């Protein structure tokens, strides 16, 4: 059914810094020359980025999984179609619906079906000498395909695929959000070519995909692509071939910030409201310049940490066990009037107990109770067989 | 991106209280709304108070629910003659004992076991090891207030007036510059019109 192809070598990840990214307009509306605050899901002004060394022929074989955690912010600069798709699912099996995104030079196919996933799925392509091109023939990434619900096919919109050799001269962007049974995928392409890994670009994404899906997800994996290598039987090589690529990893958290529109309706300069006091005083004042003096801001309040209770202990000392113990009554014929009031009337006797059937109503939180005073606990003395409890 | 045509709602009879308008009073089929999401489903129909604001119900505890917005349509016509097998309607069924007060717009499809006792399924059947899926088994001659009912709810979520889903039959030519009211794509207002570039 499945073939396990793992490597014992593991390398810890590396971290870097992220400049001003993760920004979008809160609403589809348009505005000019008017400043406006905003409180929704975004990415702060300064943070860190995590990209893995997905180069293995020095070499490093790392194909791990990433938890969902309510949306993951992505960005990639692939040139040889390294990142093919993203498989979603807590268990990644045929019992959960997954997403299959495949992009080619003819059509963009987005399928959401329950494809069977092996232990180590990977897509491989070959290169025919006669045709002098690359095609796909090893479609072993999925074993079974059932419960087909969604299937969308469209032409490539923001992908050119014209340059034969592009040395990291592109910027595709993806935004993932799973709220209200939806998985929105925002698209953004801006040409960038600089020296550093991360330039100082700043441009909000534009909505293009609003596909809904309702399922609890806490784990997913990013797919990949492989190029077949012609090896002799006696070569005894590693058997794995891959290119050069990387992918940023981040997560989402709701905060509040500030935006400033321009005459063209695009945020030109924005201050981070919760970065520092100099920008904190601009949260209240609607200007990006402040004169000397004193400016008040949101008050400093310490929230309490310890929240515990101290209820009475003795009060009235075992309402039912002082004369009747746990349970012991006199003859059936004598219905003696015995009521205990102004007492604890706790229900510690029926918590553990043994078998019994009770009065079969327990209106408020059955077997919890112990929250009302009640008038009295008058317990008449009588014995019955109990089999005719319905009577 | 269609014509909606809500005038068909006034046809037929039965249904139930709308109990969700939540915008303002005047005319029905003028505004273009934002998004029309139809989520028709079939319940026992014993009580529809769960679909009402507040009053969480047994089915809505693990199924469709509106958290606090609603504003939709909860049209639900009674029908027992249709889609009713003579030997019990075993097709319809429901899932039970799924936590308590789940997220409203979040559906799940899985059985496993709730593990409400002490021994889980561990991939096999057992006591208190039932997959949460119980056949409704509607009977053609089982009461009137308990026979299956057809109910469809609508999301609405009115936030963007100029949208694409509206089909009023009224059509008028565009005005260049006249101090008149405008109702383009469900957006109402008054003023004067002026052409410019942006």
């Amino acid at each position, epitope marked *: 059914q499945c073939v396990n192809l793992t490597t014992r070598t593991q390398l810890p990840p590396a971290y870097t810094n992220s400049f001003t990214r993760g920004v979008y307009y809160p609403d589809k509306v348009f505005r000019s020359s008017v400043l406006h605050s905003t409180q929704d899901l975004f990415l702060p002004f300064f943070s860190n980025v995590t990209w893995f060394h997905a180069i293995h022929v020095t070499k490093r074989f790392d194909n791990p999984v990433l938890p969902f955690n309510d949306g993951v912010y992505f960005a990639s600069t692939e040139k040889s179609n390294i990142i093919r798709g993203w498989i979603f699912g807590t268990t990644l099996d045929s019992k959960t619906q997954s997403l299959l995104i495949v992009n080619n030079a003819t059509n963009v196919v987005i399928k959401v079906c329950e494809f069977q996933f092996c232990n180590d799925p990977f897509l491989g392509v070959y290169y025919h000498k006669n045709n002098k091109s690359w095609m796909e023939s090893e479609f072993r990434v999925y074993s079974s395909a059932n419960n087909c619900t969604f299937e969308y096919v469209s032409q490539p919109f923001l992908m050119d695929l014209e340059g034969k050799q592009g040395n990291f001269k592109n910027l595709r962007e993806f935004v993932f959000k799973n709220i209200d049974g939806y998985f929105k995928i925002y698209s953004k392409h801006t040409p960038i070519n600089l020296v550093r890994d991360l330039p100082q670009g700043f441009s909000a994404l534009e909505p293009l995909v609003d596909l809904p899906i309702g399922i609890n997800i806490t784990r997913f994996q990013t797919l990949l692509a492989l190029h077949r290598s012609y090896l002799t039987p006696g070569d005894s090589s590693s058997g794995w071939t891959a290119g050069a690529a990387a992918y940023y990893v981040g997560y989402l958290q709701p905060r509040t910030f500030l935006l400033k529109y321009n005459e063209n309706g695009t945020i030109t300069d924005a201050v981070d409201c919760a970065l520092d006091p100099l920008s904190e005083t601009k949260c209240t004042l609607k200007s990006f310049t402040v004169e000397k003096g004193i400016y008040q801001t949101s008050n400093f309040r310490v929230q309490p940490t310890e929240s515990i209770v101290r209820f009475p202990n003795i009060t009235n000392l075992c309402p039912f066990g002082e004369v009747f113990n746990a349970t012991r009554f006199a003859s059936v014929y004598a219905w003696n009037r015995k009521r205990i009031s102004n007492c604890v009337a706790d229900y510690s006797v029926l918590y553990n107990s043994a078998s019994f059937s*009770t009065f079969k109503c327990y209106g408020v939180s059955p077997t919890k109770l112990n929250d009302l005073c009640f008038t009295n606990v008058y317990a008449d003395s009588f014995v019955i067989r109990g089999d005719e409890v319905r009577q | 991106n269609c014509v909606a045509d809500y005038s068909v709602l006034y046809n037929s009879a039965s249904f139930s209280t709308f109990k969700c308008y939540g915008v303002s009073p005047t005319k029905l089929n003028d505004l273009c709304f934002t998004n029309v999401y139809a989520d028709s489903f079939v319940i026992r129909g014993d009580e529809v108070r769960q679909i009402a604001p507040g009053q969480t119900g047994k089915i809505a505890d693990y199924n469709y629910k509106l958290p606090d917005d609603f504003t939709g349509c909860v049209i639900a016509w009674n029908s027992n003659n249709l889609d009713s097998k003579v030997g019990g309607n075993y097709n319809y069924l429901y899932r039970l004992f799924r936590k308590s007060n789940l997220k409203p717009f979040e559906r799940d499809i899985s059985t496993e076991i709730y593990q409400a006792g002490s021994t889980p399924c561990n991939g096999v059947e057992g006591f208190n090891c*039932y997959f949460p899926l119980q056949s409704y088994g509607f009977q053609p001659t089982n009461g009137v207030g308990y026979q299956p009912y057809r109910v469809v709810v609508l999301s609405f979520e009115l936030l963007h007036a100029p949208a694409t889903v509206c089909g009023p039959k009224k059509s008028t030519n565009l005005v260049k510059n006249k101090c008149v009211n405008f109702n383009f794509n469900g957006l109402t207002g008054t003023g004067v019109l002026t052409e410019s570039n942006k």
Partner: nanobody
Amino acid sequence: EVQLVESGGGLVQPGGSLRLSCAASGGTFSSIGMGWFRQAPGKEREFVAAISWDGGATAYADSVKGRFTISADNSKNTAYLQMNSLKPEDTAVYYCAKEDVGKPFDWGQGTLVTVSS
């Protein structure tokens, strides 16, 4: 301790049909794990089936498919079962436990059921 009563068992010709009764007097009225169990001679006790008290859920083992259907009565607080295609190895003793709030598999005494000619 809980009281469980089982009756109606005995010798039956092969491929017969038995209607045994398990009258559960009370039972905390919070049942979640009503099910029957068998103990074949020299064979360890194994799961047979189960019936939910809050629903019509009736799970069955692989070996009792079709030939075994169990049912209860919320009004009567009983547990009935019907058998078909009795085959010699089915000769064993059965039980009907009561699993409830705290109540473990409230075990009883069962009844001997004989499948032979």
